[PDB]
Structures are given as C-alpha cells and as structure tokens.
Amino acid sequence: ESEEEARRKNWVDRGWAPWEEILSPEANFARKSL
C-alpha cells in the first residue's frame, strides 16, 4: 500500500491526526540528534 493510501485509512478508520507535541529543551535534542 502506498503511503498516501495508508494515511487515508488511518484518518478515516483508526483516528490518526498529527497533533502537536510540546517538548522540553532536552527532548528536542533527543529527537534531532539521534
């Protein structure tokens, strides 16, 4: 399945939404660095 299709299924069916994540000075480092 193409990603485009899968992104649809997840929105229509399983409820996905790319909600915002507010992160600490340290967690941001973690996400970018690794």
Alpha-carbon distance of 34 to 1, in angstroms, equals: 28
Token readout for 32 is 């970018």
- Nearer to other proteins by Cβ, of 14 and 31: the residue is 31
Q: Compute CA 25 distance to the chain's CA centroid, rounded to the nearest angstrom.
A: 19
**Number of residues counted as binding other proteins (CB under 8 A):** 8
Query: What letter does residue 31 receive in the DSSP assignment?
Result: H
Residue that has been written with the tokens 């996905």 in this structure: 16
Query: Per rule CB under 8 A, is residue 33 in the interface with other proteins?
Result: yes
**Closest approach of other proteins to the CB of residue 12, in Å:** 30
Residue 27 engages other proteins in binding (rule: CB under 8 A): yes
Q: Does 6 bind other proteins (CB under 8 A)?
A: no
